[PDB]
Design a protein around this ligand. Structure first.
Ligand SMILES: [Ca+2]
Ligand SMILES: [Ca+2]
Ligand SMILES: [Ca+2]
Ligand SMILES: [Ca+2]
Ligand SMILES: [Ca+2]
Length: 340
C-alpha cells in the first residue's frame, strides 16, 4: 500500500543513522530490478542525497551507499550519466583510497560499471582522477581488488585514442606486461583484455605496447593448451597487427607466423576464425610482410580452407587470400559491464 519513493527520499536527509540506512536499503532493493525502476528511483530525487552520503564519516552508510550506487550503475547509460551529473565520481576515487577492502571492492565495481559507457563518461571518470589510483592498485596482492582494477582499466582503455593515451600516461603498461607471465589464468584473462583494448588505438599506442616487451609473451602463449588464453592472445595479437607496417614487422619478428600457420589447420572454429583475423590484419600492409606470410606456407592452407563447409570461415579465408595477392585492417574493443 502506497509508494515507497517519497518516504525513502525524505529519510535520505534524516539525521538518524538507523532509519537513514533503512532508506538506503530500500533504495538498493528498489534499484535492484528493472531499468524503469532505477529511473523511477532517480526521478524520485535520491541521487543528490546518495552523493552526499558517499562523503559520510559513517562506514555503514558509506558501504550502503556503495551498494545502492552499484545497483543504479547496472542500468542504462542515461542513468549512469545522471549519476555522473550528481557529482559522485570524486567520492568514488577517494573511496578507492580506503583501507576497507569491502568498500574498496564495491567502489571498484561502481567505477568499472560506470566506465562501460560512452567516451564522455570515460573522460569524466578520468578527470575525477581514477587512473593513478588504479595503476597503484595494479600492484596489490589482493586478487579481488586486482581483478576489479584490471577490469576498470580495460573498460577505460576501451574508449577513444585520447583515453588510451591517458591510461598509458598513468604508467600501467609495465605492470600489465609483468602480469602477462602470471600463473593465475583469471587475472591473465583480464590482463590480456586490458592490453588488447589498449592496442585497439592509434599506431603510437601499439608501438608503446610493443616497446613494453609484450610481443614475446603473446608469441609464447600462442602455443598454450588453454583455448581461452589462446583466443585472448589471438585477440591481442590481431589488435597489435592492425597498425602500421612497422608494427606488423615487429609482430613477424616475434615469430608469430609459424604458430598462426599451424593454427590454420585446427578443428576449433573459434580458433580458426581468430587465426584468420590475425593473418588478415597481418596481410594488411607492406609487401615485405605479405611475402613473409607467403613463405610461411599460408597460401596453401588458405586455398584449402576455401573448401571448408562453414561459410564464414570460407569467406574470410577468401578475403585473406585476396588481401595476400592484391596490394594493401580491423580493430576490436571489449567492455565489461555487470549487474547485481
Ligand atoms: Ca583493511
Ligand atoms: Ca594474494
Ligand atoms: Ca594457475
Ligand atoms: Ca585444452
Ligand atoms: Ca570443430
Amino acid at each position: 500500500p502506497g509508494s515507497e519513493l517519497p518516504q525513502m527520499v525524505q529519510q535520505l536527509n534524516s539525521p538518524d543513522q538507523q532509519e537513514l540506512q533503512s532508506a538506503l536499503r530500500k533504495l538498493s532493493q528498489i534499484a535492484s530490478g528493472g531499468n524503469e525502476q532505477i529511473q523511477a528511483v532517480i526521478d524520485a530525487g535520491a541521487l543528490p542525497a546518495l552523493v552526499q552520503l558517499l562523503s559520510s564519516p559513517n562506514e555503514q552508510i558509506l558501504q550502503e551507499a556503495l551498494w545502492a550506487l552499484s545497483n543504479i550503475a547496472s542500468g542504462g547509460n542515461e542513468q549512469i550519466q545522471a549519476v555522473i551529473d550528481a557529482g559522485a565520481l570524486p567520492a568514488l576515487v577517494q573511496l578507492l583510497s580506503s583501507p576497507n577492502e569491502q568498500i574498496l571492492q564495491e567502489a571498484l565495481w561502481a567505477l568499472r560499471n560506470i566506465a562501460s559507457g560512452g567516451n564522455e563518461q570515460i573522460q569524466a571518470v578520468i578527470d575525477a582522477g581514477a587512473l593513478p589510483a588504479l595503476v597503484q592498485l595494479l600492484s596489490s596482492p589482493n586478487e579481488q581488488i586486482l581483478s576489479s582494477a584490471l577490469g576498470a582499466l580495460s573498460n577505460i582503455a576501451s574508449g577513444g585514442n585520447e583515453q588510451i593515451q591517458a591510461v598509458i600516461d598513468a604508467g600501467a603498461l609495465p605492470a600489465l606486461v609483468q602480469l602477462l607471465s602470471s600463473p593465475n589464468e583469471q587475472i591473465l584473462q583480464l590482463a590480456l583484455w586490458a592490453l588488447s583494448n589498449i592496442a585497439s588505438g592509434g599506431n603510437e599506442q601499439i608501438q608503446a605496447v610493443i616497446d613494453a616487451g609484450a610481443l614475446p609473451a603473446l608469441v609464447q602463449l600462442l602455443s598454450s593448451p588453454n583455448e581461452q588464453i589462446l583466443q585472448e592472445a589471438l585477440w591481442a595479437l590481431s589488435n597489435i597487427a592492425s597498425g602500421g607496417n612497422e608494427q606488423i614487422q615487429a609482430v613477424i619478428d616475434a615469430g608469430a607466423l609459424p604458430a598462426l600457420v599451424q593454427l590454420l589447420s585446427s578443428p576449433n572454429e573459434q580458433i580458426l576464425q581468430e587465426a584468420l583475423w590475425a593473418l588478415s590484419n597481418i596481410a594488411s600492409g607492406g609487401n615485405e610482410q605479405k611475402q613473409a606470410v607467403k613463405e610461411a606456407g599460408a597460401l596453401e592452407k588458405l586455398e584449402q580452407l576455401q573448401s571448408h563447409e562453414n561459410e564464414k570461415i570460407q569467406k574470410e579465408a577468401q578475403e585473406a587470400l585476396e588481401k595476400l595477392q592484391s596490394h594493401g585492417s580491423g580493430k576490436r574493443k571489449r567492455k565489461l559491464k555487470f549487474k547485481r
